[PDB]
Design a protein around this nucleic acid. Sequence first.
DNA 1: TGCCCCCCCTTCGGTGCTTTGCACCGAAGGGGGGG
Lengths: 406, 553
Amino acid sequence: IETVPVKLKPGMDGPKVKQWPLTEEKIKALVEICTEMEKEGKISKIGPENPYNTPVFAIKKKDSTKWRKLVDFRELNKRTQDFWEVQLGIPHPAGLKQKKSVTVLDVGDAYFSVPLDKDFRKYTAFTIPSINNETPGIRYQYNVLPQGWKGSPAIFQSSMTKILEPFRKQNPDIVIYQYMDDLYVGSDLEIGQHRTKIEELRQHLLRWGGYELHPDKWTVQPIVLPEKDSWTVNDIQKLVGKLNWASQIYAGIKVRQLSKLLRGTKALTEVVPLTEEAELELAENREILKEPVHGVYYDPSKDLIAEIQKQGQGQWTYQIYQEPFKNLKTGKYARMKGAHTNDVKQLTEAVQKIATESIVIWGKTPKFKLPIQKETWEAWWTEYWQATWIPEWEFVNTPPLVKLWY
Amino acid sequence: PISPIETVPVKLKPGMDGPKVKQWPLTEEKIKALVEICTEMEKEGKISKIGPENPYNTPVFAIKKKDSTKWRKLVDFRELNKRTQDFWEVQLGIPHPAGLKQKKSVTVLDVGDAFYSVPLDKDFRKYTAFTIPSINNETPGIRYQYNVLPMGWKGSPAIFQSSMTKILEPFRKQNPDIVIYQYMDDLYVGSDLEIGQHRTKIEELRQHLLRWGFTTPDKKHQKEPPFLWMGYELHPDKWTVQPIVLPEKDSWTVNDIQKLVGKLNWASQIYAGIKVRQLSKLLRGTKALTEVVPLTEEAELELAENREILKEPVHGVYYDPSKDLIAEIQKQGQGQWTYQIYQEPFKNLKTGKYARMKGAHTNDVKQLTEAVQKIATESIVIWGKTPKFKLPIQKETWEAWWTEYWQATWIPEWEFVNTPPLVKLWYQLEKEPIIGAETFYVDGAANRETKLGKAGYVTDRGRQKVVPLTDTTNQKTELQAIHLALQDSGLEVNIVTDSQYALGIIQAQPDKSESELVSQIIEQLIKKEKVYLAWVPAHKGIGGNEQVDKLVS
DNA sequence: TGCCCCCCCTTCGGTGCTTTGCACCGAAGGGGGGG
Ligand SMILES: Nc1ccn([C@H]2C[C@H](O)[C@@H](COP(=O)(O)OP(=O)(O)OP(=O)(O)O)O2)c(=O)n1
Ligand SMILES: OC[C@H]1O[C@@](CO)(O[C@H]2O[C@H](CO)[C@@H](O)[C@H](O)[C@H]2O)[C@@H](O)[C@@H]1O
Ligand SMILES: [Mg+2]
């Protein structure tokens, strides 16, 4: 076929990111996978005169015992030209989040049938490492649209719609959204009748070349205030601090008539009775906290941001926003992995589910602010990753000034 | 000979041209060294004569090879290197002997004149122009250019290593149960064949290399143990480092101490217990490499301790993939950790140390977690798997850390080992305020422009204090206010501050810090029985905090 | 008077914060070791 001409953004060079260490079982899989891809012409062996590089690793799903090659093209996608500027982007359908059930299918393999602009291939280089550095690294680059590259869904756009249009006519009320290498397909059909047109969709795809989501129980967790019969000075201090922060989010929340309940230099354990005008102020603030914030709308031109907090006993609060204090979604992720013990696994799973929810709802992943040391995350996260995409993230150490989300 | 392998295409960076750098003077012993190398490299075709249409030049010299009676030719391509394209280096790390398996038959070969057997891109040769001086005064010089990889060019190591990899690959695939460790032109070749068949495969490997232009001189063909390899000595059952000689000096310069620490760090891969904290402390705040630094008392002791450790003979063992990897860690003090990795007890594969201070404020549990993470990474690099850990921390200590620390943290499978000093939390803040304890409302303000501030407190028992502070900061006065409350309170205290900054540091429960004032707060926290620390927003008129903020302003 | 790689220890300069210093991070300087 003919290649589509592709550019990096003006004044940017290709990625230059070092490969990180890999286990034995991940190196063998990459060697098995890439030698087959070389034989099928999808990748080519290259040398050091190509100055670019992108890390590679492998993931294996709990349900799917096979290894899946994953190239971390985050750096390259940032530097790749916009395709919304060239009008080949994928519109997000609003209805998907409405559906009873949504299944995710990995269709990255379809990209391997379309060649890549010969002048862009060098930017796709990656290096397989060696155990105990027995040999130098082995370098390949792509000849076809790479999995994980943001240009592949855009170039394959025209083709995917024609492969899908018979299924789309046959089934008008199922909605299909392509995001990177994934197809998110949702419907209202029975918990197990839905799954069968999944299987019919996949055979039509296997003709040419995870688990069930359920959005109508992606409940929001609001800010809630304690309930007691008796209140210590410390309780009132903490409650005044919690609402003083929340007044940056909501409108007309007031502390004047709980603050002066604490006039004087009082002991932290002394039990202060509640005036009527303080119950006035509290029961009302409970109601503003009840229902969502007025005036908060999604903007597709701006980035999504996600913050997470460890709360303990297996639970994790999160907020998604674009401008600070204008949350599009507040939530609480709970594990049931078994032993309660592994924080890094729970947070890695939390990031995948939160990012999955943004794809379903808005069509793109958020930039995560992760409550973890950089090198604790990098020591362990690939152990638990199951997605074909990788969101952007950064590492924060914000102590909890107030327990706002519990 | 020159390999018939295809050359690797190389470019100069865009906009750039070639180097133009006149030659400098060398001895006669080194001019005749190179003329013998250079009329003889010309006869084998490694270089060619050029002249004035080629406008480029680059200076050349020679140093003596570590084998004596042989000279290494080198050209100062510093200029050309800057205008030569970037490369992606394929040497990703260094092989370690603890990653090797026991082998029945072992051979070590080295390729002769490795770089000179690999040709250079035809179109790039003209940028390698140089000149041979011949006593400077007698003749202007003779111009040559390289037809092969020059020693000193930025791209030569990568292009050699990648070339060697292509040449080896037919042999590796045809012989999957012969391990070839390939570092530059140095080949370790192990196998589980009886020495007869082994040497057949060896001579066939050498003949395959010869067809592609890589000689293997007998001189560097090691056939018997101990093998000299990558700085080590390979015996059949064990390995050792080649002897480590440390400097011994009446008077030490900064550069001497820099060399001492580097050798000790090298020794720490097999000698357990090495420490360099106090020797490296001497390098701080210094301003010159020739500055004489007297050793502190603590540095003399640490050096003496290391010298005792090094006088003992040590060895590592090789990797048995059918047995688990076990990593054991001990605490040494002042943020220093040492570890051993083994499979059978008292049979170390290797050792190591971790001694970095990450953060201005941290604690032993954080640093133990970092040591675990470094060991985990090193184990992946060497063996492709993480080890089971044996740690001097109790399950209750760890469990108390990951429930009251707000960041996600983790540590793999580990067995508690009782090797004091144990890692422990040195205090824990109460989750709830303390009945009967005094309540201190602390506050401190500083003048951005003046440097002058005050720290102070108010108390539910009527106590008050304000101390004036000079040359201070906003964040310091808040830390200082907490310092006062801890200084004047009893064994159980309730403290209310309005600085998220101060709350953040102390709630992370640090036990050490680069700040003397934070260190003072830590020593006071450790002597207390119970401490509850609480935050409130400032300037919202909340009782206690408002009264103390009045008093500080 | 050279090149490339890994490691550790120290110093410095850039970034973001509802900041005015502070904490973090990556690069660069020295050392060790390899070819
Ligand atoms: N100080 C050094 C040592 C080595 N090398 C590179 C170039 C060498 O060609 C190659 C191999 O190192 P050797 O010591 O084996 O030197 P040679 O192979 O060139 O010659 P010999 O026949 O003596 O081994 O590594 C280098 O650039 N600078
Ligand atoms: O974890 C950060 C660490 O990862 C690297 C690649 O190993 O960068 C990746 O992650 C960043 C954070 O999202 C991206 O900005 C970047 O594009 C991506 O390659 C390292 O560069 C970085 O140290
Ligand atoms: Mg050699």
